[PDB]
Amino acid sequence: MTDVYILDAVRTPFGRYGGALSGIRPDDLAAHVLRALAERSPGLDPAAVDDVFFGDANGAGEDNRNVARMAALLAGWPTSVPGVTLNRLCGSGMESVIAANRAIAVGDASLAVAGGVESMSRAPWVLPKPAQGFPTGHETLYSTTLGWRMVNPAMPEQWTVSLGESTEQVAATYGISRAEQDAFALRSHERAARAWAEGVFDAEITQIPGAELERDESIRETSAEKLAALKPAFRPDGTITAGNASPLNDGAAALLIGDAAAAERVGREPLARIVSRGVAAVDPDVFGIGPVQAAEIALRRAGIGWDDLSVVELNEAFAAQSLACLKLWPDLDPEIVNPNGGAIAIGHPLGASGARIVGTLAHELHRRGGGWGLAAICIGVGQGLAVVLHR
Amino acid sequence: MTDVYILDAVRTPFGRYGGALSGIRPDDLAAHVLRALAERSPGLDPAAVDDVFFGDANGAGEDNRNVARMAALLAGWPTSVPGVTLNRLCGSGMESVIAANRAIAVGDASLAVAGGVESMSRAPWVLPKPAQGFPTGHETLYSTTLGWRMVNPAMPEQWTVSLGESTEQVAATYGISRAEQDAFALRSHERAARAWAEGVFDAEITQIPGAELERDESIRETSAEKLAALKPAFRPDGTITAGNASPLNDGAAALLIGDAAAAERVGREPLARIVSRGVAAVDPDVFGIGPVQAAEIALRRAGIGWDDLSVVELNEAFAAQSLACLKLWPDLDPEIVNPNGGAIAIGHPLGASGARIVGTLAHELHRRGGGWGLAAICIGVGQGLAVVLHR
Amino acid sequence: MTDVYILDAVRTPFGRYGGALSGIRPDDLAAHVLRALAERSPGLDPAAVDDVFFGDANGAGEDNRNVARMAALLAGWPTSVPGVTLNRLCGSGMESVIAANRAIAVGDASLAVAGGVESMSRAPWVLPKPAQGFPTGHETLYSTTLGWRMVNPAMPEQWTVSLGESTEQVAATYGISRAEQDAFALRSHERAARAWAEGVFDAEITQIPGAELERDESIRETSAEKLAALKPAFRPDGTITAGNASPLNDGAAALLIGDAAAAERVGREPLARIVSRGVAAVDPDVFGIGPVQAAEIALRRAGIGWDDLSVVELNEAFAAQSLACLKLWPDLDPEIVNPNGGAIAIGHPLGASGARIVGTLAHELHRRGGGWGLAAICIGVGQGLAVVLHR
Amino acid sequence: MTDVYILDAVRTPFGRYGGALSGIRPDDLAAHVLRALAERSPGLDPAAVDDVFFGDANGAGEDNRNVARMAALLAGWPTSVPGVTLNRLCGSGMESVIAANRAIAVGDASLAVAGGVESMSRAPWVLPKPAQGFPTGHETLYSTTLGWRMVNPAMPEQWTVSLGESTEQVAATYGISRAEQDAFALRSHERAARAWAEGVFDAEITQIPGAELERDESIRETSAEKLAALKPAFRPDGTITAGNASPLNDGAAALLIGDAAAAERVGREPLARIVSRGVAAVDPDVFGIGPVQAAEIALRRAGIGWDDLSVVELNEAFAAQSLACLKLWPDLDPEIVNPNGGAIAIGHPLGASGARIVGTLAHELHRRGGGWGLAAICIGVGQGLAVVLHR
């Protein structure tokens, strides 16, 4: 068993849906963070990368046929660098971290890239082919942007509710009121904006040439009254709104991950050690609390408890979802949960988010001069991933 | 690091394109082999599955949004069973074995499923969204069935050549003659048909109710004459034909993978131990020989040489590709390669293939009363995977 | 008013949906009947054709952009020959007859072609474009084969019911039983088969080279018992079946129409005079009876009554629709309706039907040595057209 | 032979492509001008309309399935009002005037509506259907906005050149210089801008509630220099530009057309009498001059020469086209041509244009206290229509 380190973590600013990165193909987003990784580490010879992992919740569009591999090629890396793309929907970026982590831990790799990428803007349509010639009926052109598509008839209907509907149920079940959601959403915008303004993300940001963003595009100067005025998006009497739900976003993130040997090879002091990982799945209709058990597992494997954490990166698919996770965990000091904001403000380009929050967890642990960090991400269809870092 | 075993390995017969499985949604194919794994192992409580890994080279269709998870839900498994879908194109099924292997080896899991699924028949169309309203020109509706789509303008042209064109290049470069390819293709059909007839595949086969197959549908009674008569598929003067290339196919394979504790929990004797794996990447236009270093790496990691192998599953993307791999492995006896035929005859549903050949390797080593096995699979954009098994 | 004659009338056999003409582009269907008209009248100089009218209820596919003109060009006809395509849905082929008839009657033309064409097999899909970039939702890919599509929200819902649903209501309203409908459907098949067998359609048939049909493909050897066994197509308790409804079909018909000057110029003895025409419109949900008033109008304008008709060509959209028209035409002897069968058996390639029945009415009148004929056709959104012929 | 009058003529302003009317479904555009005809003539009982004719060059989208009928229904006219849609491409709106004219002239109708409608913004995509199940290669999704689509392989290539390219050859063949075209284009903008400002179109305009247009949206304040600055749109060395070519446009136009009895019944004094019409067809590649013979025919049928005309509405598909027509009408004083501008400035929503220019001509003739007017329109696959009016 080999210790595994985040050597570097970088990501584009996240574009909002149809926003500043909506013109950037997802394979180019992935290629770009790879480029950025190589740029950021002159001691990194890309040929030394044993495998490139990219989380990608879609892949039907321009990121098709294994975006990790395409990205390495597009980044100008040697064709000897393998790549694999992983889909654990919303958590795919953290799955790729875990996948790379495992590859190195078992000695299959010394140096790996774990990225995540989503262009939700350029999520294409998918049209099923007819099984017979001259189909007569109207077909559905499925948008891959959001939600279920080409739903299996045998799939229990209660599991195919929208993520927002599921999260409404979770909010109702766990008593996550609209005000707590909006308070959590507001804090996300406040901390994300402050983190950006104070240069907190400078360490982890690569700008797309010609598509620069001063900060994550979904970050707003908003207010409790502004969020309170929004209409519910999933139920007429609902609590989830566009303001306390994550946006749909574009972006990519990539982490350089190696063992101690790779760290010296590349010439980089690890941001943090990947200690442990956890995965959990729940009823799809409460997917937002998917990470609850995953985080418990990761913490236990790391030999620590909630009190040992100095940073929690809990991906904010929805304020309600994040709050429900927090309600199922021991009280965490608010200051440590998404200290620099989260996906409500920063954006949630599915494949990218799980890599981003591990990467920014690592940077944050580096800024704090050490400590235990937990990154946890809920997944659609009811899963959760968690990674424990230690600097 | 824990020893990891293939506890069971099952697959559907593979349907040919538009063939006997073409009416079965790929998420249903994956769900079927999961159901079959649970039926096959009465001591398997599906709640014991820590993760479900499915290789899937496509996933834009009915298998969208993490088919591994979809499959587990569709199989009636507890919502607690997580699922992750991996794309290393044609090697995805073996990537997923390796993913599962690593998860258990590091102790993140004790029991896992590593499957692969592809419905190449039902590979949908993909239509990119317009960035602007009221686009004016004719658009391309991309088929996801084969080859490149929504090609990045920056992707080197030489790397986007068709798999067959690349294999023609590899055939020429390594002197793989048309007769040699067709001899290898003929042997694939003969061995596959014989294996079916002699019950060799009964250990690994699950029938789809209502879509049963007497044998893998692409298996033909054929001859050197019939093969030599075929027109070239990729060049007027070419060597690759429909006959010495794998078909496009539909199928799923799934392996129950566990450590010793899982084997005891599930009450199953390991078919074989997963000893090691390799990954390699090469110029995309020589993808056919992608497995070469991967096998070498895997063998090195397993502490064995080619002489120690008693079975090799070399996935038969193209006879020429496969023969080129054997040439670059001079020390390998070609008569222990694909003893029961391969993908030329059995079919090549991309995502399932890498799982199938590991699974059938395990069964073969079980039939032979033990020994070292190598499974190797080339991947389309210049990659290769290899797994070494020991019973 | 100038007297206007049907100089010739030809049609392809009608192929069944996805049947023998499904490989023929509709513009080629139309061009073929133009070539046939030209072949059939050696005295016809195509340059003498003042205008080509084609009924076509679709036109979204390969018959797009004025199939009439396209067909004239594809038929080798001089570029001097104008062409116009008319859509009065199911009655479009009769509309073009009337259009040609009017053009000549007023002296805008002396010689015209009135055709109708439909390739219901090749009826394409229509995808509306997004008004903004990066559309988010699932879109409908509308089949143009059948029914309403791209339905205006403001269209009264009662009017957007399917033709079969509407005709179920009409069947209930007018007491047209299942057995009555099947008897009329049987009658259609028997008379159509008999007409073909006896060479009655030889006078009007042109065969597509390479897609020849022994007879109209939808004609079957059926029986009261087979028809009674058929399941209802539009309600669990309904009376309309696939057997007592017209099929979906492909086919083209074209009539050479001219005044006496044209008749002499072309060297053709008129089959029949086009005496009069009627149009009417009803609630879309009783479209089946749209012809009722249209026929009354045409009869009144011809100065004749139901008494005086020796042949009625009532397009058989549905047995129940045709029977309802008969009930509402109590002075009409049902016996003289569709003596050579109708669309239930011959097929109903929308655009072609209204021209076919006028052309076959002219031939029948010719066979009978003269008399008054009425052709009437119901139209999908609540219309009806009728033409009175006299030889 | 009954005298036939334009009793009213109305149109929407024309929005440009993607412009102010781009949110209005074409059937609603058509329905709107119908509602306006009813609103404008309170003596009009819409049930008195015997037939509604609409030119529509597309019909693939929301105006599918006989937009004339659909529009009558959507306008809330009695379901007894029939409707028919006509496609002679660019000339469809004039075809429909002619169709209504003929219906009344022969006594089939007393009161008719002749409309034209086009939403080129909302021109949908069409996807041909597979003849066989599970098609495998990329497909073309055809836009119906402009030009040829689903081209017949048997159509001579010479006839499938774009409209711009054809007009380039015509402009070359008839020595129509860039400057001459731009002068004509400038003049169209100047006269159309002036006509709007002076209130000239107020008599014929109906605004779409919520989509009001101060004037036709393609009218611009332009200049000889701005037009001279434009780059050629169809050849490197070309003379045709986006500025001397019509735009793509949305709009609808509708004429209330009746005999003297209808005029008295609706309580409307005729704007003009429809005296005659012409149709002609030419080689597709010189379609711009299609109207030339059509106008000659119509004049000769009206008993007049060019000298007699006080107004000519020549549809401006291209300045070069329009000038070549003028060139071939040597006895036509070009200064009476499009006195209020033309399609270069007003816009060219194909199906609407032929109705608009007849309608505008009627209004202009009314505005001048009588006279002879000619409307002519070239048509894309080599045709032309002409209508002679007289007040």
From TrEMBL, chains A, B, C, D:
It is an enzyme of class 2 (transferase). The keyword Acyltransferase applies. Belongs to the thiolase-like superfamily. Thiolase family. InterPro entries: Thiolase (IPR002155), Thiolase-like (IPR016039), Thiolase_acyl_enz_int_AS (IPR020615), Thiolase_AS (IPR020610), Thiolase_C (IPR020617), Thiolase_CS (IPR020613), Thiolase_N (IPR020616). The active site is at C90, H348, C378. Keywords: Acyltransferase, Transferase. Residues 269-390 form the Thiolase C-terminal domain. Its EC number is 2.3.1.9. Residues 4-257 form the Thiolase N-terminal domain. The lineage of its organism: Bacteria, Bacillati, Actinomycetota, Actinomycetes, Streptosporangiales. This is Probable acetyl-CoA acetyltransferase. The keyword Hydrolase does not apply. SUPFAM superfamilies: Thiolase-like (SSF53901).
